[PDB]
Structure formats: structure tokens, C-alpha cells
Amino acid sequence: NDIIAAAKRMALLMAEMSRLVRGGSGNKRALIQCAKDIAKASDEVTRLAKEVAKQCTDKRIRTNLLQVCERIPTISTQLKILSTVKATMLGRTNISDEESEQATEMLVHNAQNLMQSVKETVREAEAASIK
Template sequence: MPDWKDTTAKILRATEQVESVLGGETIFKKQPEPNQPIYNEALNLHVAIRDWSSRDNEIVAVAKRMAVLMAKLSDYMNTDKQHEVLTTSKSIVTESHEVARLAKKLAHECSDHRIKTNLLQVCERIPTISGQLKMLTTVKGSSLGQRGAASPEDKEAMDMLVGNAQSLMISISDVVKAAASASVKIMSQRGPRIKWVRKTYY
């Protein structure tokens, strides 16, 4: 087939589009609003990892789910959905622990001391940050739906929540980068462990 490259590229694009829809990544197609700083942090993570294929790579798959969950958390907070805020934050914590677990497992298979240490260090930040997220969303969630001007305490809690979301999204992005480096080192010594494939279509 003289046009096999074009045909293959079309198939790959279609497959990735289906994966994105099923994974909820279409939430990032909307234009970010200035009053959604947490959504912007989720978008930053999405942009940082979207070019990695999640097929045969659970670390990337979980990181992408986390970006979607954080974007949903922002939407729920803006629409005063208290129950959804709390359940989504719990899901984010669960997924963050899964990223750390997978990355630590990968780190212990890496013989390069520098890469291994770096990956373990970025993993260590995640449980503390995600635990703080759960606490902060519980505090903020309890005030959702209440009318009236926001108190200084509410503003402080929101600022802390935004800062926490930023720290968590950056940490997850750092884990993905460090895990990719570890995988390359492992692959050079023992063959493929986790597939790291950039979504490029000729």
C-alpha cells in the first residue's frame, strides 16, 4: 500500500481519540476560566503528559486519570456539589497512592543510583500532599452551598487548596518524567518493562 503511512496515522489518531473520550480527557477541550485556578493546575498536568500514550503504561494512565479528576473537582466546587467534591478528592488520593506505588516498584528495578534516588524522592512527596488535599477539600466542602460573602478564613482555605493542587499536579508530572528515565535505563539493561511511546503520527 503506497499510502500505508497515512492510513496507519489515521488509525492511530482515531484510537487515541477514543481513548481520550473514554478517559474523560475531553474535559480539557473547554476554555479555562480565570475563576478556576484548580482546573488550570489540572490542565498543566494534562499538557505535561498528554503526548505519552497510556497503552501498556499504567503510570501514565493513572496520571491522566488524576488530571481529569482534578478538573472535575474544580467544576464540582464551582457548582457547590459538596458530595462530589468529597468523593472526587478521595479518588484523587487513591490514584495518587497508586502512582507512587507503581513508580516505587519501578525505582527498585533501576540499577542507576541517581535515577532511582530521584524517583523515590518525588514519590515520597505524594502521600503528604494528597493527604492535605483530602483535609482541605473536607474543610472547603463543608462551606459549599452556603450563601453570603466569603470570609477571610474561606479565602485562606481556598488559597491553600489551590497551592496544594498545584503541588500535587507538579509532583505527579515529576514522577512521570522520573519514571520515564528509569524505564529507559531498565530497558537498556533488561529489555522493555513499561512502554513509553510518544503519540506522533508521522
């Protein structure tokens, strides 16, 4: 059951990301990669949800499932872009440390929201397998 597997994987990636963001400038490349690895996993969640949706039979559940999975691409796209901007923003000394910290925080907030979107998707996926 890859949805449960993906949800656990997403949690492990987020636990690691929380750890990487507590660390230094040495976690720069890793942070860019972390965002990439999260983006690959979201593309898998989205893909699985579309495949499951095709085999699903109740229109309401199918619609509710389609409603939640369609926001995942947009958040994953935003993560790749905002990470590319932040990545290129590190290594510059003119910009303020508080503004830099806020970029890390914003990225964390967006990751938390992505995780919440997946959390809601998991919840709906679990319920759909009953019918």
C-alpha cells in the same frame, strides 16, 4: 503502562475538579469525593513508583525517583485533611464568603501542586524506562 494511564487520569480528575469548583453548593459532596478519588490515585502512583524503583538499576535515578515520590504521600494526606475541614466548614453562615472562596482557592492551589508533583514524577518515570 499504568504511570502514563494514571497521569492521564489525574489530568481528567483535575479538569473535572476545576469544573466542580466553578459550580454551586450542590458540588459539596462531590468535592469531598473528588478529593478522595484523587487520594486513591496518588496512592496508586506512589505504589507503582516504589515497585518500579525496586526493579531499577542505576542508583542516581533510583534515588531521584525515591526523592520525588516521597513528597506525594504528604500532599495526599494534606488533601484529605484539609478537605475534611473545608467540608465541615461549608454549611456555616458566620464565616465570610471571601474566606470561603479563599478556602476553595487554597484547595485548588494544593491540587495544582499535587498535579505538579505528579508531573515531575511522570517526567522522571519516563526517563527511567530508558535505562
